[PDB]
Design a protein around this ligand. Structure first.
Ligand code: HEM
Ligand code: HEM
Ligand SMILES: N#Cc1ccc([C@H]2CCCc3cncn32)cc1
Ligand code: FES
Lengths: 572, 84, 87
């Protein structure tokens, strides 16, 4: 056994012992030490509450930092040049009597800049325009007039846009982080006897579900289990494209790829989740495929028409939109319920001895009520299409716009090609520059526009007292384009995230969120995106003449209103 | 209501007449009698030597008379391949 | 000739079954069966191979099946009446 001294936030040196080969997360929870909030996600790299600062001579001889850990450390308050995550650090012989250490870290609320606009004028604008496609441009103009912080006269609500503020906001992250509740979606769950899933839960029910989901949806261990399956879909996508490309005289195919990409994510998702191969890649869309995609579009659309109203108003002003909203959900829940009645029946008659997808595990483990697996299985089947495919288009688009960056991501991919063809798991590690390109697309084009938190205690950001119970919103669009942190912000430059990683700059890459409510599909999205683009770069050149900027629409998520005409020229 | 095909080889034993009559009798007896048997027999034969057929919906199926008697429910069936 | 259709039906099903992780395919088979009988019938009768087994339904296939359903349906509405009444 080994002795390890922990310096707490209050300044006191706690001493305990652990066995060699133990994670210092094990050392902390198996001795009930009083480090509040330490180890929230029980060792699945889905939080940064095991953050610990090490002595120079111990830190130097520790294992190299993985991208999975470094991305987590980037969302850790009080980051240091000597900090690591306790969950990833197993005790070793040379750490006897090691000393680790955990980090520590005004005008009234009403003196903050106010949004000129009026709740009701805007409410009625939406009543007729049936949407507010331009909202992201309104808020950018606001921040560029009022400063990096303002409130909206409504209840209290403040909109921020800096890493400084996101770092503080995570310090306040409770044991039960509270995102605000979307009543239009929950109304649907209440009306049909359905359980809300993680996206729409708060309090203990949230924490209960999440801790039984992270293991098989987000863990690096689960990511290694389904990464080979995504590889098969992305391979089949490029070989499908190449066949048709090579039939044309000039070894090229230019097209609008938005449809083919959306059908890729449906396939990679449905396979990773339900182990089923739908046969949508390479072949024509199906009726169920296009009905599912439409219902999603209608659901997002009808959400912005009901989100800003209480149900007391939208009841009688836009009852039709309620009918429209539910029939969307009706089609969605029909698609998802059938993938699960498919697998529940299968598994009932034989439990397999190998990996058969994410939900298969959850069902086998049976740590959740089936009505609670059904609800999360829905959230995952429906969240894994639009949010994954729009970032994936805009990446292709920016590579066609930036030939320089393309040829460098290509070299990287060809270089690592054989290494990945033998063992797909290596894409995590062998493609660092491509992963920096996904941060660059989601910086400029963040399909998740806002992070929201109802705070659980008086805090303060940018010197304006923020009382408890207040909504805070992180406008990622204006965040990504602040030239002060992102030199020449509209320039597409993936190498910038490698520059950033050396220095201890924090919270710069936050489109999936932070804390334990950060996106559960975060590493599934990254898997689907990374390999498709990897397999496309080692076979095709991507070009385009439409290099104007693409106008982007707000329909609950931030998406392009233009889909560009891209060329895929085969290399031989 | 018990599904037991052997009963038709035991009915063949103790000679009992007119027990299997869904195609009719006489010379107005169904002209497609042996084409139907052919289509049905071989499909199921070829399915049994490759697949296992299972289902959770083992409630009875409600049947509707719409000239012919047919099921109003179509059950969700699993085809698991055998490999040995 | 029927053997060929039933063989092509199982080998079609097996291909798709074997693409799934668990070596299984659960579904509502009523459509695929109906298209089997159209194929086995049309081949035994006219010697023609319509290519409905293993591939997607055709417009003519689904229009034919619907017309059958409507015909049976509309028959029970007129069978018990003399045409003096149903007129
Ligand atoms: C680029 C792709 C994606 C982006 C940018 C994104 C963004 C986000 C954001 C910002 C949140 C809220 C974070 C917070 O409140 O702290 C979130 C939550 C969530 N996302 Fe995504 N997401 C993406 C893909 C996905 C995928 C593919 C899935 C499912 C397969 C998914 C399912 C979820 C779920 C279930 C939650 C709820 C997490 C919770 O409340 O604990 N997302 N996502
Ligand atoms: C399980 C399948 C079938 C059943 C249970 C069935 C049943 C019957 C029955 C009960 C009759 C009347 C018997 C009688 O009046 O004595 C009949 C007649 C007839 N069936 Fe079917 N049938 C089947 C399949 C078929 C098929 C596949 C065809 C055509 C390929 C067909 C064509 C006919 C014809 C043409 C008659 C008229 C026979 C006559 O009036 O002499 N049937 N069928
Ligand atoms: N049910 C459900 C459900 C369907 C789609 C989503 C998608 C779209 C809503 C915004 C977002 C953030 N991360 C994922 N998503 C989230 C939940
Ligand atoms: S507990 Fe170590 S990262 Fe979540």
């Amino acid at each position: 056994k080994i002795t390890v001294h922990f310096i707490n936030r209050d300044g006191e040196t706690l001493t305990t012992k652990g066995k060699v080969g133990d994670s210092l997360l094990d050392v902390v929870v198996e001795n009930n030490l009083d480090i509040d909030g330490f180890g929230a996600c029980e060792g699945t790299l889905a939080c940064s509450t095991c953050h610990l600062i090490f002595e120079d001579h111990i830190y130097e001889k520790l294992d190299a930092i993985t991208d999975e850990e470094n991305d987590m450390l980037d969302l850790a308050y009080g980051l240091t040049d000597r900090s690591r995550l306790g969950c990833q650090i197993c005790l070793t012989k040379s750490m006897d009597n090691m000393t680790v250490r955990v980090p520590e870290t005004v005008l009234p609320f009403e003196a903050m800049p106010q949004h000129p606009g009026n709740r009701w004028l805007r409410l009625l604008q939406i009543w007729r325009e049936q949407g507010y496609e331009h909202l992201h441009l309104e808020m950018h103009q606001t921040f560029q007039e009022l400063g990096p912080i303002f409130r909206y006269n409504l209840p209290r609500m403040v909109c921020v846009m800096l890493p400084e503020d996101v770092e503080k906001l995570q310090q306040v992250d409770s044991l039960h982080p509270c995102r605000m509740i979307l009543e239009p979606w929950v109304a649907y769950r209440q009306h049909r006897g359905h359980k809300c899933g993680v996206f729409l839960l708060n309090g203990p029910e949230w924490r209960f579900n999440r801790l039984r989901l992270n293991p098989d949806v987000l863990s690096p261990k689960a990511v290694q289990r389904f990464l080979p399956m995504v590889d098969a879909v992305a391979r089949d996508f490029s070989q499908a494209l190449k066949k048709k490309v090579l039939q044309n005289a000039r070894g090229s195919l230019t097209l609008d790829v938005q449809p083919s990409i959306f059908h890729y994510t449906i396939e990679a998702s449905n396979l990773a989740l339900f182990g089923e191969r739908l046969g949508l890649v390479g072949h024509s869309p199906s009726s169920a495929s296009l009905n599912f995609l439409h219902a999603l579009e209608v659901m997002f659309k009808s959400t912005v028409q009901l989100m800003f109203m209480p149900r007391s108003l939208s009841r009688w002003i836009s009852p039709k939109v309620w009918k429209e909203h539910f029939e969307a959900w009706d089609c969605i829940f029909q698609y998802g319920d059938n993938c699960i009645q498919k697998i529940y029946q299968e598994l009932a008659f034989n439990r397999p001895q190998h990996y058969t997808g994410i939900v298969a595990e959850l069902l086998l483990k049976a740590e959740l009520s089936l009505e609670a697996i059904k609800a999360n299985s829905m959230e995952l089947t429906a969240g894994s299409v639009d949010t994954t495919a729009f970032p994936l288009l805009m990446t292709l688009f920016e590579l066609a716009r930036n030939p320089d960056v393309q040829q460098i991501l290509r070299q990287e991919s060809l270089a690592a090609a054989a290494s990945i063809s033998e063992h797909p798991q290596k894409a995590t590690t062998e493609l660092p520059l491509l992963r920096a390109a996904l941060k660059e697309t989601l910086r400029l084009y963040p399909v998740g526009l806002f992070l929201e938190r109802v705070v659980s205690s008086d805090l303060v950001l940018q010197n304006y007292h923020i009382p408890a119970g207040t909504l805070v919103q992180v406008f990622l669009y204006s965040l990504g384009r602040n030239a002060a942190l992102f030199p020449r912000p509209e320039r597409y430059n993936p190498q910038r995230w490698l520059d950033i990683r050396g220095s201890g700059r924090n919270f710069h890459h936050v489109p999936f969120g932070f804390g334990m409510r950060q996106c559960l599909g975060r590493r599934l999205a990254e898997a689907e995106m990374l390999l498709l683009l990897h397999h496309v770069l080692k076979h095709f050149l991507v070009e385009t003449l439409t290099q104007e900027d693409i106008k982007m629409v707000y329909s609950f998520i931030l998406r392009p209103g233009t889909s560009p005409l891209l060329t895929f020229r085969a290399i031989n | 209501e018990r599904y037991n095909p052997q009963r038709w080889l035991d009915i063949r034993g103790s000679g009992r007449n007119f027990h299997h009559v869904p195609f009719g009798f006489g010379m107005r007896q169904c002209l497609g009698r042996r084409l139907a048997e052919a289509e049905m027999l071989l499909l199921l034969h070829h399915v049994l030597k490759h697949f296992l057929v299972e289902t959770l919906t083992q409630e009875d199926i409600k049947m509707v008379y719409s000239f012919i008697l047919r099921p109003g429910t179509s059950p969700l069936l699993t085809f698991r391949a055998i490999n040995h």
